[PDB]
Design a binder for this molecule. Structure first.
Ligand SMILES: CC(C)(COP(=O)(O)OP(=O)(O)OC[C@H]1O[C@@H](n2cnc3c(N)ncnc32)[C@H](O)[C@@H]1OP(=O)(O)O)[C@@H](O)C(=O)NCCC(=O)NCCS
Ligand SMILES: CCCOP(=O)(O)OC[C@H]1O[C@@H](n2cnc3c(N)ncnc32)[C@H](O)[C@@H]1O
Ligand SMILES: [Cl-]
Ligand SMILES: [Mg+2]
Length: 633
């Protein structure tokens, strides 16, 4: 069953079926001309000459786009929209408590970004310095990000759910000189400590780069204060000049870093530069959401994730759209909250995650009870696979069967949408990301690297670069080359598996490496295992994900305790909290299976294939029977 393109969308779409085909073909056959023209979606201070200059060569990966051009991301997201749309709302902020909200015009946002840019400069921050941002979903988070970009300071945003230990890990790696946070974040009626977490992270003896902590008073809760080091947001910004001229940044100047979980090791800092990234974010946002001036757009993704960077802030603001930043959760106070927000602000485009969709779907009609939803024209899905059932429920209950759903597949490392439908150009299949975006050349290869043609399945790779591609891993280009370009020579390996049907539509099935999808969040099994083994009483651990009807995968941890230790309610709680302390609550194991029978190879390597099956229910071969019986209990 394929959903046809509705007449209302066909009548106003920026790209129709024929135009998609033509543009895609040119983007592949002649990227220099295609992207040379499309790059004009942004204002450049000095024009670029060279467009595409990339190589996926083994151990010699180099990616550059519009390299000789200069620009400023903040000028593109703010300044250039002032003359004609200064009074237009740039950000609609909806608080956790619906009684709280703000409408921030482009002019107001520009003013605050200018004041905060000067605040950073006066504090000593210069182009190239890394600034850690550990903020909740409040407008100030966007102000800080845009201000860093404006002066060329590389921001390192850290999701508020990261534990103090995880926060320290990011700061140590990036040598951030400044941390911008809030006393507390507000979510689902609860206050989440943030400042206290920063205090604890800074006590780590390995953190030596941080000289100041700017704190926003969001809740006014009693927090510890270190005079001199800590500074109040309000005190600083109110003393800064609202006058700031944007300086030109090179297309390849670093813009931001996002720590992302991988198959092995702890999170690495995926680095994005400026030019190609912004061109790609603005282009994908505009065409995939079919953005028209005046449209009210709402991405539910947290600012701490790449989706928040590209589609909550940068892509939309670059295009002059009104973007909505929601402080809370889709189902608080009630499951109808998301749709109530849609009605309250007359949202025209809604972009959310399958886990959220499934959580609302579990409440049936209570998710739409008392809501209208008529303002919606476009729906979107991101972050993980979505089954036909959830897709249809979303399409019917939320979209009232009138809105195309754009299921966008991409990753932190890709900067923007990679395989996605365009509302007025591609007919939809529930659960399918469909076709590649302009400039994207996907392929499916077997474990040997052989490309598979026609209707088939295999490892998902991208055979050439695209403007928004991550350029490296902070401080470790060698690891960047090995992680993404060594498995299949001359190709970018996504780590995902996928199938392509008879029509050429892609269906992303999920990670084929040891990366999990927990509630729409990317987590490495290795990092959870390392966290567990760090505990004084744990000798070894094997972590696998198991299917979960709501969050996609639940975390199942097989744990071997040292001799002298025994399981107990206390230890069960201590171990679960230990992971929460080492990484954060998102990585807390849902199940702890105590065992001394971990399956291993004769070389001593643990075999997770067998553990994966057992947890789902599906050197010493005797461990299998033992594990099975322990699992039964
Ligand atoms: C459906 C959903 C709202 C459910 O939220 P939930 O009921 O809090 O459950 P989660 O699994 O997200 O959270 C589990 C833990 O993380 C914590 N947590 C979640 N988000 C947090 C945040 N922004 N800051 C701090 N802590 C957070 C919770 O407090 C909880 O910890 P606790 O039990 O110790 O209090 C949520 O999982 C979601 O939005 N998922 C989709 C992710 C997404 O947008 N993906 C697209 C790619 S970004
Ligand atoms: C894109 C925002 C999240 O980026 P992250 O880097 O955190 O995670 C990327 C991974 O999320 C899944 N994923 C993401 N979007 C989809 C999607 N639309 N369908 C299926 N899986 C998806 C894929 O496995 C991919 O390797
Ligand atoms: Cl303040
Ligand atoms: Mg140990």
């Amino acid at each position: 069953h394929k959903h046809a393109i509705p007449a209302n969308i066909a009548d106003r779409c920026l790209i129709n079926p024929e135009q998609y085909e033509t543009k895609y073909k040119q983007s592949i056959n002649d990227p220099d001309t295609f992207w040379g023209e499309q790059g004009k979606i942004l204002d450049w201070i000095t024009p670029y000459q060279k467009v595409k200059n990339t190589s996926f060569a083994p151990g010699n990966v180099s990616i550059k786009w519009y390299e000789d051009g200069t620009l400023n991301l903040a000028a593109n997201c703010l300044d250039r929209h002032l003359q004609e749309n200064g009074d237009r709302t740039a950000i609609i902020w909806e608080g956790d408590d619906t009684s709280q909200s703000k409408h921030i015009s482009y002019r107001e946002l520009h003013r605050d970004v200018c004041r905060f840019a000067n605040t950073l400069l006066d504090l000593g921050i210069k182009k190239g310095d890394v600034v850690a941002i550990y903020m909740p979903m409040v407008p100030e988070a966007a102000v800080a990000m845009l201000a860093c970009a404006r002066i060329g300071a590389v921001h390192s945003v850290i999701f508020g759910g990261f534990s103090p230990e995880a926060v320290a890990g990011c700061i140590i790696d990036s040598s951030s000189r400044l941390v911008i946070t809030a006393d507390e974040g507000v979510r689902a009626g609860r206050s989440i400590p943030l400042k206290k977490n920063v205090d604890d992270a800074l006590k780590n003896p390995n953190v030596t780069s941080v000289e100041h902590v700017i704190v926003l008073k969001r809740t006014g809760s009693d927090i510890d204060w270190q005079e001199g080091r800590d500074l109040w947001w309000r005190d600083l910004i109110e003393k800064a000049s609202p006058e700031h001229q944007p300086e030109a940044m090179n297309a390849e100047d670093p813009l931001f870093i996002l720590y992302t979980s991988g198959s092995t090791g702890k999170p690495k800092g995926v680095l994005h530069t400026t030019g190609g990234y912004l061109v790609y974010a603005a282009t994908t946002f505009k065409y995939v959401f079919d953005y028209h001036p005046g449209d009210i757009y709402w991405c539910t993704a947290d600012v701490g994730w790449v989706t928040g960077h590209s589609y909550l802030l940068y892509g939309p603001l670059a295009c002059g759209a009104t973007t909505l930043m929601f402080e809370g959760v889709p189902n608080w106070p009630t499951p109808a909250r998301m749709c109530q927000v849609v009605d309250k602000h007359q949202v025209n485009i809604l972009y959310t995650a399958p886990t959220a969709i499934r959580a609302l779907m579990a409440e049936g009609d209570k998710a739409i009870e008392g809501t209208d939803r008529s303002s919606l024209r476009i729906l979107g899905s991101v972050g993980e696979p979505i089954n036909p059932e959830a897709w249809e429920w979303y399409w019917k209950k939320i979209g009232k069967e009138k809105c195309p759903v754009v299921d966008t597949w991409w990753q932190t490392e890709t900067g923007g949408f990679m395989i996605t439908p365009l509302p007025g150009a591609i007919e939809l299949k529930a659960g399918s990301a469909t076709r590649p975006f302009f400039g994207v050349q996907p392929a499916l290869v077997d474990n040997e690297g052989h490309p598979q043609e026609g209707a088939t399945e295999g490892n998902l790779v991208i055979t050439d670069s695209w403007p928004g591609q991550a350029r490296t891993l902070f401080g470790d280009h060698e690891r960047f080359e090995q992680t993404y370009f060594s498995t299949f020579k001359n190709m970018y390996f996504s780590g995902d598996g996928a199938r392509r049907d008879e029509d050429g539509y892609y269906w992303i099935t999920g990670r084929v490496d040891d990366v999990l999808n927990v509630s729409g969040h990317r987590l490495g099994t290795a990092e959870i295992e390392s966290a567990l083994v760090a505990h004084p009483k744990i000798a070894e651990a094997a972590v696998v994900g198991i299917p979960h009807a709501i969050k996609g995968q639940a975390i199942y941890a097989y744990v071997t305790l040292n001799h002298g230790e025994e399981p107990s309610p206390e230890l069960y709680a201590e171990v679960r909290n230990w992971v929460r302390k080492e990484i954060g609550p998102l990585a807390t194991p849902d199940v702890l299976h105590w065992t001394d029978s971990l399956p291993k190879t004769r070389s001593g390597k643990i075999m997770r294939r067998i553990l994966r099956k057992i947890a789902a229910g599906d050197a010493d071969p005797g461990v299998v029977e033992k594990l099975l019986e322990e699992k039964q209990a």
